[PDB]
Amino acid sequence: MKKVVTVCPYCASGCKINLVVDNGKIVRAEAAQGKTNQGTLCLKGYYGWDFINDTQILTPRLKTPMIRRQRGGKLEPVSWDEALNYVAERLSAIKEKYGPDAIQTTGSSRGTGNETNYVMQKFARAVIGTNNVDCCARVXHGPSVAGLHQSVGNGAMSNAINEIDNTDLVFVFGYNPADSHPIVANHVINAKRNGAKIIVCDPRKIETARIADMHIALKNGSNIALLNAMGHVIIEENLYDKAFVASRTEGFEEYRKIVEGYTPESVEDITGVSASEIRQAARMYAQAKSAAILWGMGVTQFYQGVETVRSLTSLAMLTGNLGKPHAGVNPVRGQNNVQGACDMGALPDTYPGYQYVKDPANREKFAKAWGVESLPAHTGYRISELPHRAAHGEVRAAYIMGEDPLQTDAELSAVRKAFEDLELVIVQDIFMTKTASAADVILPSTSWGEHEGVFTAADRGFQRFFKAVEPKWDLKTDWQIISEIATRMGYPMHYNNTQEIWDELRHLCPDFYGATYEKMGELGFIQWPCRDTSDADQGTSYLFKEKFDTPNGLAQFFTCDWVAPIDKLTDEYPMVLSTVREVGHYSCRSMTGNCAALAALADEPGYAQINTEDAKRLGIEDEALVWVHSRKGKIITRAQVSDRPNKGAIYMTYQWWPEYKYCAVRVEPIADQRAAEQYVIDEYNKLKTRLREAALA
Ligand SMILES: Nc1nc2c(c(=O)[nH]1)N[C@H]1C(S)=C(S)[C@@H](COP(=O)(O)OP(=O)(O)OC[C@H]3O[C@@H](n4cnc5c(=O)[nH]c(N)nc54)[C@H](O)[C@@H]3O)O[C@H]1N2
Ligand SMILES: Nc1nc2c(c(=O)[nH]1)N[C@H]1C(S)=C(S)[C@@H](COP(=O)(O)OP(=O)(O)OC[C@H]3O[C@@H](n4cnc5c(=O)[nH]c(N)nc54)[C@H](O)[C@@H]3O)O[C@H]1N2
Ligand code: SF4
Ligand SMILES: [Mo+4]
């Protein structure tokens, strides 16, 4: 019996886990003394390791490569040699004929690791010769990045997760850590425990709200309105940090100009918050010696999402809550490694280390390092643009690794036809997902407990995770697959281990250079920038101490006018629909749902939080399956009646097989519940056998 140290592959909290191995199998998992979790794990880290053993509760783990040698296809098992040769040849042929930009590749924000993301972007750039690399996941706060990037020059959490504990005030906005990042919620509770004030801006009465000094339950979608009003009060009452605004920012006057009209009274009906509440929240935020803002999707998944991010960052600027510890602007994003995949350059406009491909010097260094004449300089296509690029014949092949767009992208039928429009779709995954079943070629890889690497936690903290068990089938790591394809296409690539990949990149990225494997060790948490390999350099806790990373080093102010959501509530669709998380289960459902204990927790079709009062009116009972109506939309879900959601809006999840946070719908009860249940079991059985029939063939 031995314990192998790893990092949770669920959410970005970065909890260290000791996987206990006995014989050649993982026996159980227990918390380790990581930087962030310090001996605590939530339900998913504790029980979510089971999926590695191919339980088949939902879908089987991929065991062999496959090729569908005819669109009306029999996806048939094949040797690695046939798969790899097939891909390298198709890609070469597509490239020569239509050009490198005719192929699209994806990074992956899950259990694969940073190293393989560096290998895929290298593959796209040095081998195919395109900048078409991108992560879907990087919509975990896609808007956050550039939005935040224009205000501050860096889209990362400005301060450490561990710095939260000592904030004087936590400003939670469109963020529900209790379900989303359990271990980060603990840091917030500990902050309150150390004596911090807490303000929660959220429509729903989430867990955090109950410990909050002030719960600002604004109306779904009234974001910029309240934000402008708060900025208004802060300036009106002279609560801003003038010295800071003068020496470190730009844009005050134009911001001030706009927020002027946004008096608290003027926005009481739009936000549904009383002016005194607004003023009080604004003063509490302004009065705190140090305040930290944490946000999530309730900010980004809105048309005015990108605006709200910059609008919040402005409050932080106004109050000089940047450049010091226990403060900051902190988008706590989703996946265990959404941060890493970005840090590794799995983006169409930067090499790893946030070294823009548009810089001739950056290209010179990389092209030299990669032993290549020229590296493309123009931005690549974004994975979100696939349907469109495929339809118009601009991208002829998609190399999708560790993503499930045929389950996760909006209006999935769109991606089904893109797949239909593409000449070739390669899907490299760990499970027979809906996306994998639609592919032309499946390339099976190792999973999280079967390989090693590094992940970057929510706050840019690099961490090592180790291989705890061998794959039981003939699998290759994602980077071995890409490397061999690269080699068969004429570009020599092979690595003996992930440290070979890491050291290579360390040498090509100044801000990552000091974070050696040794420094990270089994429990080191090293936040970049980490420039010197010397033990004296343990990383950077908070960003912007001296300057701001914007071209002229000053943060940039911004807000705009509040604009009501696109979905007009009607007498026909009187309710607002918004999605939300819940522990137990995790996004894609492929891992969480293939764990015996976790699958026991989540029911099909899944819940829809409905407000006690709303339900009564509509004649909807708790646990009762229900109908949710929209334009060209009707979904069946189980009602979870409660006082938590706010009257007028229902909150479903999406972890079941664009202004995503606001949608006008009409919830209606079901009479023949028994005919509804059977329908659900029926559809679920159908999909399950489908995927099974695809893999087990
Ligand atoms: N409609 C809609 N679209 C969205 C969002 C939304 O909420 N709604 N949100 C955005 C956000 S925040 C996110 S997080 C994304 C999420 O969407 P995706 O990026 O698709 O994320 P997952 O669905 O978690 O898919 C990860 C896949 O990688 C596979 N995988 C896991 N480990 C490995 C590995 O080691 N190797 C390989 N090759 N594969 C592996 C898993 O089995 C799974 O199939 O979508 C974004 N776009
Ligand atoms: N258990 C579990 N945890 C997860 C995941 C999972 O699948 N399961 N997925 C991970 C991933 S990939 C992601 S992207 C994150 C997403 O997690 P979060 O960023 O926490 O996002 P949600 O819970 O979807 O929405 C956050 C909050 O925004 C609030 N909100 C909605 N509309 C508004 C608004 O108009 N204004 C304001 N102020 N608030 C609003 C909602 O009530 C909700 O409480 O979770 C991650 N953690
Ligand atoms: S908080 Fe997140 S990273 Fe930690 S054990 Fe739970 S799912 Fe894993
Ligand atoms: Mo996400």
UniProtKB/Swiss-Prot annotation:
Q: Does the keyword NAD apply?
A: yes
The cofactor remark states: Binds 1 [4Fe-4S] cluster per subunit.
Query: An example Gene Ontology cellular component term from the record?
Result: membrane
What InterPro entries does its record include?
Asp_de-COase-like_dom_sf (IPR009010), CT_Formate-Dh_H (IPR041925), Formate_Dh-H_N (IPR041924), Formate_DH_asu (IPR006478), MoPterin_dinucl-bd_dom (IPR006657), Mopterin_OxRdtase (IPR006656), Mopterin_OxRdtase_4Fe-4S_dom (IPR006963), Mopterin_OxRdtase_prok_CS (IPR006655)
Gene3D superfamilies to which the protein is assigned, alphabetical: 2.40.40.20, 3.40.50.740, ADC-like domains, Dimethylsulfoxide Reductase, domain 2, Single helix bin
Give the enzyme's EC designation: 1.17.98.4
What does the activity regulation annotation say?
Inhibited by aerobic conditions.
Task: Describe the subunit structure.
Answer: Consists of two separable enzymatic activities: a formate dehydrogenase component (FDH-H) and hydrogenase-3.
The name this protein goes by in its record: Formate dehydrogenase H
Native organism:
Escherichia coli (strain K12)
Lineage, opening ranks: Bacteria, Pseudomonadati, Pseudomonadota, Gammaproteobacteria, Enterobacterales
Whichever gene encodes this chain, its name is fdhF
